[PDB]
Short mmCIF file of C-alpha atoms and ligand atoms in Angstrom, two decimals:
data_model
loop_
_atom_site.label_atom_id
_atom_site.label_comp_id
_atom_site.label_asym_id
_atom_site.label_seq_id
_atom_site.Cartn_x
_atom_site.Cartn_y
_atom_site.Cartn_z
CA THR A 1 -4.47 7.45 -27.34
CA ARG A 2 -6.18 4.13 -28.07
CA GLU A 3 -5.67 2.99 -24.47
CA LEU A 4 -7.11 6.21 -22.99
CA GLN A 5 -10.13 6.06 -25.31
CA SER A 6 -10.85 2.45 -24.35
CA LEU A 7 -10.66 3.18 -20.64
CA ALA A 8 -12.80 6.33 -20.76
CA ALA A 9 -15.46 4.64 -22.92
CA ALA A 10 -15.55 1.33 -21.01
CA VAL A 11 -18.40 0.60 -18.62
CA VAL A 12 -17.33 0.68 -14.97
CA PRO A 13 -18.90 -2.31 -13.16
CA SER A 14 -20.22 -1.92 -9.61
CA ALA A 15 -17.98 -2.23 -6.58
CA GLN A 16 -19.97 -5.28 -5.62
CA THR A 17 -19.30 -6.77 -9.06
CA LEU A 18 -15.60 -6.01 -8.82
CA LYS A 19 -15.56 -7.40 -5.26
CA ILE A 20 -13.21 -4.61 -4.16
CA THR A 21 -14.93 -4.26 -0.83
CA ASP A 22 -13.66 -7.54 0.59
CA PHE A 23 -10.30 -7.75 2.33
CA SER A 24 -9.84 -11.12 0.58
CA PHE A 25 -9.74 -9.44 -2.86
CA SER A 26 -7.13 -10.63 -5.37
CA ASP A 27 -6.02 -9.04 -8.64
CA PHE A 28 -4.25 -12.07 -10.03
CA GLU A 29 -6.87 -12.91 -12.65
CA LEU A 30 -7.70 -9.31 -13.64
CA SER A 31 -6.35 -7.61 -16.77
CA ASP A 32 -4.66 -4.20 -16.66
CA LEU A 33 -7.91 -2.65 -17.93
CA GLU A 34 -9.98 -4.29 -15.19
CA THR A 35 -7.70 -2.86 -12.49
CA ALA A 36 -8.02 0.64 -13.84
CA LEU A 37 -11.77 0.19 -13.96
CA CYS A 38 -11.65 -0.94 -10.32
CA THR A 39 -9.58 2.15 -9.55
CA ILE A 40 -12.20 4.39 -11.14
CA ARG A 41 -14.93 2.65 -9.17
CA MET A 42 -12.92 3.40 -6.02
CA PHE A 43 -12.72 7.13 -6.71
CA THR A 44 -16.40 6.96 -7.57
CA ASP A 45 -17.86 5.09 -4.61
CA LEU A 46 -15.87 7.18 -2.12
CA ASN A 47 -17.75 10.11 -3.67
CA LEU A 48 -14.49 11.75 -4.63
CA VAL A 49 -15.50 12.02 -8.29
CA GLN A 50 -18.55 14.23 -7.69
CA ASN A 51 -17.53 15.92 -4.44
CA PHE A 52 -14.45 17.26 -6.18
CA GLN A 53 -15.87 17.54 -9.68
CA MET A 54 -13.44 15.22 -11.40
CA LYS A 55 -13.64 15.05 -15.18
CA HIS A 56 -13.95 11.40 -16.20
CA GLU A 57 -11.38 11.73 -19.02
CA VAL A 58 -8.84 13.40 -16.71
CA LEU A 59 -9.25 10.72 -14.04
CA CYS A 60 -8.62 8.00 -16.65
CA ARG A 61 -5.53 9.75 -17.99
CA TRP A 62 -4.16 10.18 -14.46
CA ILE A 63 -4.80 6.50 -13.61
CA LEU A 64 -2.95 5.54 -16.78
CA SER A 65 -0.11 7.93 -16.01
CA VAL A 66 0.26 6.45 -12.52
CA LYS A 67 0.13 2.85 -13.74
CA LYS A 68 2.69 3.74 -16.43
CA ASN A 69 5.27 5.11 -13.97
CA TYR A 70 5.51 1.69 -12.38
CA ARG A 71 8.03 -0.76 -13.82
CA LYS A 72 6.55 -4.16 -14.63
CA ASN A 73 9.98 -5.80 -14.72
CA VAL A 74 10.23 -5.13 -10.97
CA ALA A 75 8.90 -8.33 -9.38
CA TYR A 76 6.88 -7.02 -6.44
CA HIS A 77 6.93 -3.21 -6.22
CA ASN A 78 4.91 -2.42 -9.35
CA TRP A 79 1.41 -1.28 -10.38
CA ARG A 80 -0.31 -4.37 -8.93
CA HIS A 81 1.27 -3.62 -5.54
CA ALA A 82 0.10 -0.01 -5.66
CA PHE A 83 -3.35 -1.11 -6.87
CA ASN A 84 -3.73 -3.61 -4.06
CA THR A 85 -2.52 -1.15 -1.47
CA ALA A 86 -5.24 1.19 -2.72
CA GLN A 87 -7.87 -1.58 -2.82
CA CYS A 88 -7.15 -2.34 0.83
CA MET A 89 -7.57 1.32 1.62
CA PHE A 90 -11.00 1.21 -0.05
CA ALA A 91 -12.02 -2.01 1.71
CA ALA A 92 -10.87 -0.66 5.10
CA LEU A 93 -12.75 2.56 4.39
CA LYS A 94 -15.90 0.71 3.38
CA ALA A 95 -16.02 -2.81 4.83
CA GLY A 96 -13.83 -1.66 7.71
CA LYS A 97 -16.06 1.35 8.42
CA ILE A 98 -13.10 3.73 8.55
CA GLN A 99 -14.82 6.18 6.25
CA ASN A 100 -17.04 7.88 8.80
CA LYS A 101 -13.88 8.58 10.76
CA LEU A 102 -12.15 10.70 8.10
CA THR A 103 -12.82 13.82 6.05
CA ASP A 104 -13.26 13.71 2.27
CA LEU A 105 -9.95 15.54 1.87
CA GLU A 106 -8.15 12.98 4.03
CA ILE A 107 -9.78 10.18 2.06
CA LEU A 108 -9.00 11.83 -1.29
CA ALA A 109 -5.35 12.15 -0.26
CA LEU A 110 -5.11 8.61 1.11
CA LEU A 111 -6.52 7.06 -2.08
CA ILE A 112 -4.08 9.08 -4.15
CA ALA A 113 -1.18 8.31 -1.78
CA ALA A 114 -2.04 4.61 -1.90
CA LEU A 115 -1.90 4.52 -5.73
CA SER A 116 1.31 6.52 -6.00
CA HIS A 117 3.19 5.50 -2.84
CA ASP A 118 5.86 3.48 -4.71
CA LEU A 119 6.03 5.33 -8.03
CA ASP A 120 9.11 4.47 -10.10
CA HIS A 121 10.43 1.93 -7.60
CA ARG A 122 13.61 0.33 -8.97
CA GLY A 123 13.71 -2.82 -6.89
CA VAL A 124 16.23 -1.49 -4.38
CA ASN A 125 14.92 -2.34 -0.90
CA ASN A 126 16.09 -1.98 2.71
CA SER A 127 16.26 -3.99 5.92
CA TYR A 128 14.49 -2.00 8.67
CA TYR A 140 17.18 6.03 9.95
CA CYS A 141 17.69 6.36 6.17
CA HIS A 142 15.62 9.56 6.01
CA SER A 143 12.97 8.10 3.66
CA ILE A 144 15.03 8.86 0.55
CA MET A 145 13.14 6.29 -1.53
CA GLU A 146 9.76 7.61 -0.38
CA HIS A 147 10.78 11.16 -1.25
CA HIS A 148 11.31 10.12 -4.88
CA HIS A 149 7.91 8.42 -4.88
CA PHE A 150 6.32 11.71 -3.84
CA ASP A 151 8.13 13.84 -6.42
CA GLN A 152 6.93 11.31 -9.00
CA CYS A 153 3.38 11.65 -7.60
CA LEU A 154 3.45 15.46 -7.47
CA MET A 155 4.72 15.55 -11.03
CA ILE A 156 1.97 13.29 -12.37
CA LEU A 157 -0.64 15.45 -10.62
CA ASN A 158 0.71 18.55 -12.37
CA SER A 159 1.08 17.11 -15.87
CA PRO A 160 -1.51 18.55 -18.30
CA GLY A 161 -4.80 16.68 -18.50
CA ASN A 162 -3.76 14.71 -15.43
CA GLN A 163 -4.71 17.34 -12.87
CA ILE A 164 -7.48 15.53 -10.98
CA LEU A 165 -7.02 17.94 -8.07
CA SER A 166 -8.39 20.82 -10.17
CA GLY A 167 -11.56 21.93 -8.48
CA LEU A 168 -9.99 22.17 -5.05
CA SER A 169 -9.62 25.68 -3.69
CA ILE A 170 -6.06 26.88 -3.15
CA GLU A 171 -6.18 25.96 0.55
CA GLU A 172 -7.80 22.57 -0.04
CA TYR A 173 -5.05 21.86 -2.55
CA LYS A 174 -2.31 22.95 -0.17
CA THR A 175 -3.97 20.83 2.53
CA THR A 176 -4.55 17.67 0.53
CA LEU A 177 -0.97 17.88 -0.79
CA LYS A 178 0.45 17.85 2.75
CA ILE A 179 -1.65 14.81 3.66
CA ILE A 180 -0.53 13.05 0.45
CA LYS A 181 3.14 13.81 1.13
CA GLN A 182 2.79 12.48 4.67
CA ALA A 183 0.87 9.34 3.69
CA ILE A 184 3.45 8.39 1.07
CA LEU A 185 6.43 9.06 3.33
CA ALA A 186 4.59 7.14 6.04
CA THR A 187 5.04 4.04 3.91
CA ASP A 188 8.68 4.15 4.98
CA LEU A 189 9.02 1.29 7.44
CA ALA A 190 11.71 3.20 9.33
CA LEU A 191 9.03 5.78 10.15
CA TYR A 192 6.54 3.07 11.05
CA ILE A 193 8.97 1.62 13.61
CA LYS A 194 9.52 5.11 14.99
CA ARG A 195 5.86 6.06 15.40
CA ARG A 196 4.08 2.83 16.31
CA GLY A 197 5.31 2.82 19.89
CA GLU A 198 3.23 5.91 20.69
CA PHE A 199 0.25 4.62 18.69
CA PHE A 200 0.21 1.24 20.47
CA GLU A 201 0.45 2.96 23.88
CA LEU A 202 -2.56 5.19 23.15
CA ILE A 203 -4.52 2.09 22.18
CA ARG A 204 -3.38 0.13 25.24
CA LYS A 205 -4.25 2.98 27.62
CA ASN A 206 -7.67 3.22 25.95
CA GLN A 207 -7.02 6.92 25.37
CA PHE A 208 -6.81 7.03 21.59
CA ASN A 209 -8.62 10.10 20.26
CA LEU A 210 -9.09 10.80 16.54
CA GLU A 211 -10.49 14.22 17.38
CA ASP A 212 -6.83 15.00 18.01
CA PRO A 213 -4.86 16.56 15.11
CA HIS A 214 -1.64 14.73 15.94
CA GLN A 215 -3.38 11.44 16.75
CA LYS A 216 -5.12 11.76 13.37
CA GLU A 217 -1.82 12.23 11.55
CA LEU A 218 -0.56 9.17 13.43
CA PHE A 219 -3.63 7.16 12.50
CA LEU A 220 -3.40 8.06 8.82
CA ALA A 221 0.26 6.97 8.92
CA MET A 222 -0.55 3.66 10.59
CA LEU A 223 -3.43 3.07 8.17
CA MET A 224 -1.12 3.74 5.23
CA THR A 225 1.30 1.06 6.44
CA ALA A 226 -1.50 -1.48 7.05
CA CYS A 227 -2.65 -1.21 3.44
CA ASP A 228 0.95 -1.18 2.21
CA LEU A 229 1.47 -4.64 3.75
CA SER A 230 -2.06 -5.93 3.08
CA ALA A 231 -0.59 -8.94 1.26
CA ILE A 232 0.57 -10.43 4.57
CA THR A 233 -3.13 -10.65 5.56
CA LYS A 234 -4.49 -12.14 2.35
CA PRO A 235 -5.77 -15.74 1.86
CA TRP A 236 -3.04 -18.40 1.75
CA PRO A 237 -3.10 -18.94 -2.04
CA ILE A 238 -2.68 -15.21 -2.58
CA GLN A 239 -0.14 -14.67 0.23
CA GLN A 240 2.07 -17.48 -0.97
CA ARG A 241 1.84 -16.17 -4.50
CA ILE A 242 2.90 -12.66 -3.49
CA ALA A 243 5.60 -13.72 -1.06
CA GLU A 244 7.34 -15.24 -4.09
CA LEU A 245 7.24 -11.90 -5.91
CA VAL A 246 8.73 -10.29 -2.81
CA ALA A 247 11.34 -13.04 -2.45
CA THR A 248 12.20 -12.75 -6.13
CA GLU A 249 12.77 -8.98 -5.79
CA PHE A 250 15.07 -9.42 -2.79
CA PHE A 251 17.16 -12.22 -4.35
CA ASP A 252 17.35 -10.26 -7.57
CA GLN A 253 18.69 -7.34 -5.55
CA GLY A 254 21.31 -9.52 -3.85
CA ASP A 255 22.60 -10.67 -7.22
CA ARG A 256 22.67 -7.21 -8.71
CA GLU A 257 24.38 -5.89 -5.59
CA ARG A 258 27.08 -8.58 -5.60
CA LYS A 259 27.57 -7.67 -9.27
CA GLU A 260 27.68 -3.83 -9.30
CA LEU A 261 29.34 -3.83 -5.87
CA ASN A 262 31.42 -6.51 -4.23
CA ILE A 263 29.05 -7.03 -1.33
CA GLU A 264 27.71 -10.43 -0.31
CA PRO A 265 23.90 -10.54 0.05
CA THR A 266 22.25 -10.82 3.45
CA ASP A 267 20.51 -14.19 3.84
CA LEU A 268 17.33 -12.16 3.29
CA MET A 269 18.52 -11.15 -0.17
CA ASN A 270 20.62 -13.99 -1.58
CA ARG A 271 18.88 -16.65 -3.66
CA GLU A 272 20.53 -19.52 -1.81
CA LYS A 273 19.19 -19.74 1.71
CA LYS A 274 15.70 -19.42 0.21
CA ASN A 275 14.66 -22.32 2.41
CA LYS A 276 14.48 -19.72 5.14
CA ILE A 277 11.58 -17.64 3.79
CA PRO A 278 9.14 -19.52 6.09
CA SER A 279 11.21 -18.68 9.16
CA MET A 280 11.70 -15.12 7.88
CA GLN A 281 7.97 -14.70 7.22
CA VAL A 282 7.12 -15.55 10.81
CA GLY A 283 9.61 -13.04 12.23
CA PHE A 284 8.33 -10.32 9.89
CA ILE A 285 4.75 -10.87 11.00
CA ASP A 286 5.62 -11.05 14.67
CA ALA A 287 7.87 -7.99 14.77
CA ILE A 288 6.09 -5.81 12.22
CA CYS A 289 2.60 -6.81 11.05
CA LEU A 290 0.67 -8.46 13.89
CA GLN A 291 0.92 -5.52 16.34
CA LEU A 292 -0.25 -3.15 13.61
CA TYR A 293 -3.30 -5.18 12.62
CA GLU A 294 -4.21 -5.97 16.22
CA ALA A 295 -4.03 -2.23 16.93
CA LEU A 296 -6.09 -1.35 13.87
CA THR A 297 -8.74 -3.79 15.06
CA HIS A 298 -8.87 -1.84 18.31
CA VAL A 299 -9.68 1.32 16.39
CA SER A 300 -12.36 -0.53 14.40
CA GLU A 301 -13.44 -4.13 14.97
CA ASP A 302 -14.67 -4.23 11.38
CA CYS A 303 -11.01 -4.50 10.40
CA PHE A 304 -10.72 -7.81 12.24
CA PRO A 305 -10.50 -9.64 8.84
CA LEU A 306 -7.04 -8.18 8.34
CA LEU A 307 -5.83 -9.33 11.75
CA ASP A 308 -7.55 -12.69 11.29
CA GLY A 309 -5.81 -13.35 7.97
CA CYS A 310 -2.46 -12.15 9.26
CA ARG A 311 -2.72 -14.77 12.01
CA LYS A 312 -3.75 -17.61 9.71
CA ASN A 313 -0.76 -16.71 7.56
CA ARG A 314 1.61 -17.08 10.53
CA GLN A 315 0.24 -20.56 11.25
CA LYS A 316 0.88 -21.51 7.63
CA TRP A 317 4.43 -20.16 7.61
CA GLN A 318 5.19 -21.64 11.06
CA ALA A 319 4.23 -25.12 9.91
CA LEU A 320 6.49 -24.87 6.84
CA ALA A 321 9.42 -23.49 8.84
CA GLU A 322 9.40 -26.69 10.90
CA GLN A 323 8.33 -29.21 8.29
CA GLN A 324 11.17 -27.62 6.34
C1 VDN B 401 9.23 -4.29 0.83
C2 VDN B 401 9.75 -5.23 1.92
C3 VDN B 401 8.69 -5.40 3.04
C4 VDN B 401 7.60 -6.43 2.78
N1 VDN B 401 6.43 -6.22 2.28
C5 VDN B 401 5.82 -7.53 2.27
C6 VDN B 401 4.41 -7.78 1.76
C7 VDN B 401 6.66 -8.51 2.78
C8 VDN B 401 6.73 -9.97 3.07
O1 VDN B 401 5.84 -10.76 2.86
N2 VDN B 401 7.96 -10.36 3.64
C9 VDN B 401 9.03 -9.56 3.92
C10 VDN B 401 10.26 -10.10 4.52
C11 VDN B 401 10.81 -9.47 5.59
C12 VDN B 401 12.04 -9.97 6.25
S1 VDN B 401 12.67 -9.08 7.61
O2 VDN B 401 13.86 -8.40 7.15
O3 VDN B 401 11.59 -8.20 8.03
N3 VDN B 401 13.03 -10.16 8.82
C13 VDN B 401 14.47 -10.09 9.13
C14 VDN B 401 14.86 -11.04 10.29
N4 VDN B 401 14.06 -10.80 11.51
C15 VDN B 401 14.44 -11.69 12.61
C16 VDN B 401 15.58 -11.18 13.53
C17 VDN B 401 12.62 -10.95 11.18
C18 VDN B 401 12.21 -9.98 10.05
C19 VDN B 401 12.67 -11.11 5.77
C20 VDN B 401 12.11 -11.82 4.61
C21 VDN B 401 10.95 -11.37 3.98
O4 VDN B 401 10.34 -11.95 2.89
C22 VDN B 401 10.75 -13.13 2.19
C23 VDN B 401 9.69 -13.30 1.10
N5 VDN B 401 8.94 -8.24 3.65
N6 VDN B 401 7.82 -7.73 3.10
MG1 MG B 402 7.76 2.26 -0.70
ZN1 ZN B 403 4.76 -0.32 -0.83
#
């Protein structure tokens, strides 16, 4: 197609030029083409392209297939969300020096998981066990796109490497289920508090990869004020939109969190979210690698901003 040809023939700027290494990155002013280019640069600079012999044309087709399976009409959970979640992964890996800690297969899987973790989201969200139903669909959608002809970027992996990487991908995507985060963090935080966290440990690695997946998933809560505010409105819009649709299809009144009225509470809500969900995660990630401090730092600054508003409100 015309779009595939343009992407495959375009020049991919450097990571430094695309500024995808900084945790303060923002996609707002980038076109759809520029994001895909950034995506390519990510697979490139993590050495996934050559270490796994990826055919440039196939990588481009896959990236387009993944971006396609996201619905733009969905306020927040769309391609830009997936792209940013992946960009945070890259930054954490590079700027956050998390790369030397993982294997190429783990990295390969994480990048892929990051890009496809919310595939075909329909704007139906939760509150806080639901058995990761939503996440399961996101994986099927991911698996499918990896099997579709000319989209098989995992060709070149031995049978075992494929079976391995697939498991890691499945787990990373499902990990993005907040219910699972709430379930597993307790153990993670305790290992970090007792200064006995060990990545050399299979299970503690699986736990780390899960925690890392969630940190990137929520990266927006750590971004610079302009950006955070801008994305919180996408999030708010999705929720309110859901409350309306739900009161329509069903006869159920929206929770304050999801009904348009009572929007004056987003500041108050934002503080609670950060306190109960984000902060601990980013403070813990910083314990695993101080180079991730930027995330924790920005999460904090965001709380100050939201706290002020919640009162001044
Ligand atoms: C996909 C939903 C999760 C998510 N991702 C992001 C980036 C965001 C974000 O900025 N904000 C929210 C977000 C989260 C909650 S909450 O349900 O977690 N909240 C309920 C009440 N309790 C107090 C007892 C505190 C916690 C409430 C409002 C929210 O956002 C309004 C924009 N959720 N969110
Ligand atoms: Mg999800
Ligand atoms: Zn997500």
